[PDB]
Amino acid sequence: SVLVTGGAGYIGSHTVLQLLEGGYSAVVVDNYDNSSAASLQRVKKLAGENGNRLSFHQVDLRDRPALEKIFSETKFDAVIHFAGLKAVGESVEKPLLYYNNNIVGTVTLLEVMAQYGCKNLVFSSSATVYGWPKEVPCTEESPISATNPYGRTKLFLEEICRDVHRSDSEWKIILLRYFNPVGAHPSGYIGEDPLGVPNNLMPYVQQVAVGRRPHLTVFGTDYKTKDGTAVRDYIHVMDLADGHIAALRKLDDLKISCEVYNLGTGNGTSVLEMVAAFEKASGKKIPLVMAGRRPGDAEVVYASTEKAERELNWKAKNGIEEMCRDLWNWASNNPYGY
Amino acid sequence: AKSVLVTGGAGYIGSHTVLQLLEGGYSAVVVDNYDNSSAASLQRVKKLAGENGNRLSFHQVDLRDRPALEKIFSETKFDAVIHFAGLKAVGESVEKPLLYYNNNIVGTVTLLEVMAQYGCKNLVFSSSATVYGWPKEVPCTEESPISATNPYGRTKLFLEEICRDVHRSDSEWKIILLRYFNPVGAHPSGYIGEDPLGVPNNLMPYVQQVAVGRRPHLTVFGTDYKTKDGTAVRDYIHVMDLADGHIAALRKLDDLKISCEVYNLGTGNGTSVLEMVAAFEKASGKKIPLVMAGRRPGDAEVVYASTEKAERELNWKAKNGIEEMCRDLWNWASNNPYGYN
Numbered sequence A: 001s002v003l004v005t006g007g008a009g010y011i012g013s014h015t016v017l018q019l020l021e022g023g024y025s026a027v028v029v030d031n032y033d034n035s036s037a038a039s040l041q042r043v044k045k046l047a048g049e050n051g052n053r054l055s056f057h058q059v060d061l062r063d064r065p066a067l068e069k070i071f072s073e074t075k076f077d078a079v080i081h082f083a084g085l086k087a088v089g090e091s092v093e094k095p096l097l098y099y100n101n102n103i104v105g106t107v108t109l110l111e112v113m114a115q116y117g118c119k120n121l122v123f124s125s126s127a128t129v130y131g132w133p134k135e136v137p138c139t140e141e142s143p144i145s146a147t148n149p150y151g152r153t154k155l156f157l158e159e160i161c162r163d164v165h166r167s168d169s170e171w172k173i174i175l176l177r178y179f180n181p182v183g184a185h186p187s188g189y190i191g192e193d194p195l196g197v198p199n200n201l202m203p204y205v206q207q208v209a210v211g212r213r214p215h216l217t218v219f220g221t222d223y224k225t226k227d228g229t230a231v232r233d234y235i236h237v238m239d240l241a242d243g244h245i246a247a248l249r250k251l252d253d254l255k256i257s258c259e260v261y262n263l264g265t266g267n268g269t270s271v272l273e274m275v276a277a278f279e280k281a282s283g284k285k286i287p288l289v290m291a292g293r294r295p296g297d298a299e300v301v302y303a304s305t306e307k308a309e310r311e312l313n314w315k316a317k318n319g320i321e322e323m324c325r326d327l328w329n330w331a332s333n334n335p336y337g338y
Numbered sequence B: 001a002k003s004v005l006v007t008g009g010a011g012y013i014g015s016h017t018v019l020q021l022l023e024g025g026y027s028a029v030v031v032d033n034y035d036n037s038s039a040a041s042l043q044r045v046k047k048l049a050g051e052n053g054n055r056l057s058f059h060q061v062d063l064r065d066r067p068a069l070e071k072i073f074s075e076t077k078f079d080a081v082i083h084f085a086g087l088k089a090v091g092e093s094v095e096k097p098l099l100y101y102n103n104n105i106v107g108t109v110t111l112l113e114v115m116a117q118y119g120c121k122n123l124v125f126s127s128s129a130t131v132y133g134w135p136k137e138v139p140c141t142e143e144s145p146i147s148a149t150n151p152y153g154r155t156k157l158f159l160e161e162i163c164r165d166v167h168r169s170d171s172e173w174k175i176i177l178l179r180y181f182n183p184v185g186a187h188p189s190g191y192i193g194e195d196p197l198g199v200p201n202n203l204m205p206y207v208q209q210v211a212v213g214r215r216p217h218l219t220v221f222g223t224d225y226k227t228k229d230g231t232a233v234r235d236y237i238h239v240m241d242l243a244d245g246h247i248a249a250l251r252k253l254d255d256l257k258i259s260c261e262v263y264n265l266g267t268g269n270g271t272s273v274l275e276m277v278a279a280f281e282k283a284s285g286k287k288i289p290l291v292m293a294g295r296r297p298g299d300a301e302v303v304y305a306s307t308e309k310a311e312r313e314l315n316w317k318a319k320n321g322i323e324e325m326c327r328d329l330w331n332w333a334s335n336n337p338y339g340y341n
């Protein structure tokens, strides 16, 4: 039995489905800031028999009575915490919004969790905590420093989790630094369906590919990379989902405390390479506006996979070609989302 | 004709600072939740401010209570906000980090948001020398590396960062981050001073608690340091001089080429824990039984301020020395041994 925060969202979507399919039970809480209930209806059907073990509610983590009601009626073995705003660029423009939602929401969740004696957490952290890396592939113990308010929320919230653990050794925490999840379930029955104007690269791309946005703005062209565009470690959302189930099994291992794990593929890809990958998979051509660097972006970021392999027995198995096929497969069949 | 909201204004530094605002011609509205104070301090500031008492207003309000705070900002054109409110004990922060993060960050964020809503984007923030961490170079300059070593110190580091983010987001904001060193003492009248609720975590309130007989002994946190007496060295400033620094900061806030500046408020001198205990014993005539214990989680070896920048840009320099600090502490305590009764 698992509480999934922001589980109507992109990665949450997929992870819930994986939980359901792995024998677990799931309660989702989500305020539908960047998702709708409709995504979980599709996870329900897609999950088949196991779909009877999913239940979901419209709750803001900051609504403490609403969240208390949730933990009242169910004992949680673990919380998986995906809820938050996640856009570097929105961040720089709207810092309070982000410290409000991410830190206040999370602090409330940690407080309620303790109050009801659920003290095992998997936390959605981000490669953004590496800020602008000095070193080729970012290890877990690389220097941690943020560059923008979203980065700082995640960095701050990791430090806050370390502080909780240290205060109270009943707590079992795993911090997962996701690099750049992309793709969809290969069925194409679910996928990324952000509300509002999209912020992430590939939901923006899919929407341009389908008529919903006029062009993709490329953020920066003078980077010190082989084609001038920024480089990221793009990872198949389904691999990312699976790594959460491995986090979950790791939670009651030997003597875990407050462990951090990168979840990436270890390979860097430029924004243009991603475009071109997407165009290969889609056969559609993406109009591009070349713009300046987006405030807050790192230049090259990609994972060390070694710690996650050694300790979670987890590795990503899909490559770019798969991520784009699955995305296109979801996008083709679901051009307006849900 | 100037109007100031003081968060945490019932507290040690807030109380003294509110008094100096009043004597200074300012009008002050205080919002406190009496988590670590009582109304008595502001009753007493009123009387002491004399005629200027008429310009003090005090509401009992938690910064996290957004409706209440909106009400306050509705009814009064505030020219600037001094934000003192928060939990401050590093020992408690380690045991209860959520309390600290919750109160300190939710509290501040909600204030920043209400301020921005009602067009009051002038902030003077209670930061702390604790964000200097374990400093490589002393004196500690406003340019030096910043860092925290415990939850409390994280709330100040993180909030400075947030203020910096808010500034970058929105150039209307003018923000001074005041890094207090170690406030000590009381109004020389003896009529007000520090009175924390429950167990004091700061060194000198704990000392005066032992001296009047509330507390059996002072635990010395560290005797194995690389100081002249092996005890931790800090920069202790008269709270009354700290308060004048706020007046200096408010004046400064009315300068064009300001946006988000750090100023140290210290004396620039270091004093061991045992030197402060010796100086208090001289001021009071009391013996302070000492338990020698280990270092406190996060404590720095040596921390004192560079005063250079605050001298040049704020036109402010601490005027009281250690003897004066201990004289007024004792003048307040002797007569109010258990605080506002």
Ligand SMILES: NC(=O)c1ccc[n+]([C@@H]2O[C@H](COP(=O)([O-])OP(=O)(O)OC[C@H]3O[C@@H](n4cnc5c(N)ncnc54)[C@H](O)[C@@H]3O)[C@@H](O)[C@H]2O)c1
Binding pocket: A005, A006, A007, A008, A009, A010, A011, A012, A029, A030, A031, A032, A033, A034, A035, A036, A059, A060, A061, A062, A081, A082, A083, A084, A085, A086, A101, A105, A124, A125, A126, A127, A177, A178, A179, A180, A181, A200
């Ligand atoms: N997608 C990425 O590239 C990436 C990379 C690293 C880390 N992350 C983090 O992973 C998590 C999930 O990412 P995602 O791509 O699934 O984002 P998403 O927006 O698809 O999902 C997040 C969900 O959180 C919900 N939510 C937001 N604030 C909430 C609140 N206060 N209370 C309740 N629900 C709330 C949203 O409605 C949304 O459904 C986030 O914490 C994000 O910051 C994402």
Ligand SMILES: NC(=O)c1ccc[n+]([C@@H]2O[C@H](COP(=O)([O-])OP(=O)(O)OC[C@H]3O[C@@H](n4cnc5c(N)ncnc54)[C@H](O)[C@@H]3O)[C@@H](O)[C@H]2O)c1
Binding pocket: B007, B008, B009, B010, B011, B012, B013, B014, B031, B032, B033, B034, B035, B036, B037, B061, B062, B063, B064, B083, B084, B085, B086, B087, B088, B103, B107, B126, B127, B128, B129, B180, B181, B182, B183, B202
């Ligand atoms: N005193 C020091 O040694 C020192 C050193 C560095 C920084 N500081 C900072 O200076 C500020 C003032 O310190 P102080 O010595 O006056 O402490 P204090 O405890 O006397 O003052 C804090 C005041 O804030 C109030 N308060 C706390 N949380 C509140 C909330 N959520 N809403 C409303 N009121 C709230 C308390 O009731 C109290 O009156 C604090 O922010 C502290 O962290 C103090």
Ligand SMILES: O=c1ccn([C@@H]2O[C@H](COP(=O)(O)OP(=O)(O)O)[C@@H](O)[C@H]2O)c(=O)[nH]1
Binding pocket: A088, A180, A199, A200, A201, A202, A204, A216, A217, A218, A219, A220, A230, A231, A232, A271, A294, A297
């Ligand atoms: O409209 C967009 C969205 C993203 N990106 C770039 O694509 C990469 C992936 O960014 P995204 O926002 O998806 O994730 P982030 O790396 O910020 O977590 C980065 O180099 C972004 O600058 C871009 O150029 N245009």
Ligand SMILES: O=c1ccn([C@@H]2O[C@H](COP(=O)(O)OP(=O)(O)O)[C@@H](O)[C@H]2O)c(=O)[nH]1
Binding pocket: B090, B130, B181, B182, B201, B202, B203, B204, B206, B218, B219, B220, B221, B222, B232, B233, B234, B273, B296, B299
């Ligand atoms: O009960 C106490 C409180 C404080 N200190 C020491 O006194 C100095 C100042 O402590 P305080 O907490 O007042 O100041 P901070 O350094 O936290 O701002 C530090 O070296 C503390 O270790 C101590 O020995 N015993």
